[PDB]
Amino acid sequence: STSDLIPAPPLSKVPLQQNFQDNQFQGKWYVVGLAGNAILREDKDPQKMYATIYELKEDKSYNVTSVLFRKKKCDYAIATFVPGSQPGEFTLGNIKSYPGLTSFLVRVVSTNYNQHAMVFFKKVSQNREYFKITLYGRTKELTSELKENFIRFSKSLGLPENHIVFPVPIDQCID
Ligand SMILES: N[C@@H](CO)C(=O)OC[C@H](NC(=O)c1cccc(O)c1O)C(=O)O
Ligand SMILES: [Cl-]
Ligand SMILES: [Cl-]
Ligand SMILES: [Cl-]
């Protein structure tokens, strides 16, 4: 809440997926890996897998729904991602609805659309700058190769290994 943070990387270290295809990116993605400056590995109580669903609207923004299993319930969080400056980037719709949130950016780093994606998120909340990379899969499992590529990438942004987690597959809520 008050603690020091690993700095957000310059955006020059975060690639953008070439010729992003919004229609192909839609649908359900499972969070198979998660890294960030507020993300901490927890052996005592491991992060559980959650899912994020991207529905492309006629106006070209996404209605985004995250589905999580928390405290024996299904928690649903909804947002609107508005197309940003370059295809594959997004800003947050209705940002004034979010107390303390002054900046929000999504950048799709890499994806093949049918199996995996890596996506960078940065926000400033109460003037503190957070960033996250998610490794998304169309299924709950990915290859060793994709997972190591993701660790390599997360580290290139200055995150140590204790800031890189692999949520445990579950069946509740996310299917
Ligand atoms: N301020 C806290 C409130 O949860 C926080 O951001 O930490 C939560 C953490 N998420 C993030 O740090 C985070 C970073 C950049 C953009 C986002 O949309 C995030 O959600 C997580 O996913 O467990
Ligand atoms: Cl819980
Ligand atoms: Cl493998
Ligand atoms: Cl390390």
Author numbering: 3 to 177
Per the authors:
Despite limited sequence similarity beyond minimal fold-defining motifs, lipocalins, including Scn, display a common structural architecture: an eight-stranded antiparallel β-barrel enclosing a cup-shaped ligand binding site, or calyx. The calyx is strongly electropositive overall, due to the close arrangement of the side-chains of two lysines (K125, K134) and an arginine (R81), which complements the net negative charge of many ferric siderophores. Scn displays exceptional structural rigidity, manifested by its near-identical structure across multiple crystal structures, bound to a series of distinct ligands, tolerating multiple mutations.
The Scn calyx side-chains most closely contacting ligands are K125 and K134, together bracketing Pocket #1, W79 and R81, typically swapping rotamers to divide Pockets #2 and #3, and Y106, creating the central floor of the calyx under the chelated metal. The structure of the Scn(C87S/W79A/R81A) mutant was quite similar to that of wild-type Scn, with the affinity reduction readily accounted for simply by the loss of W79 and R81 contacts and interactions. The structure of the minimal Scn(C87S/Y106F) mutant, however, was dramatic and surprising, showing complete loss of bound iron and two of three CAM substituents from degraded ENT. This result remains difficult to reconcile, as the only ligand contact involving the hydroxyl of Y106 is a hydrogen bond to the 3-hydroxyl of the CAM substituent in Pocket #1. Overall, this combination mutant showed ligand features similar in essential details to the Scn(C87S/Y106F) mutant. None of these mutations noticeably altered the Scn fold.
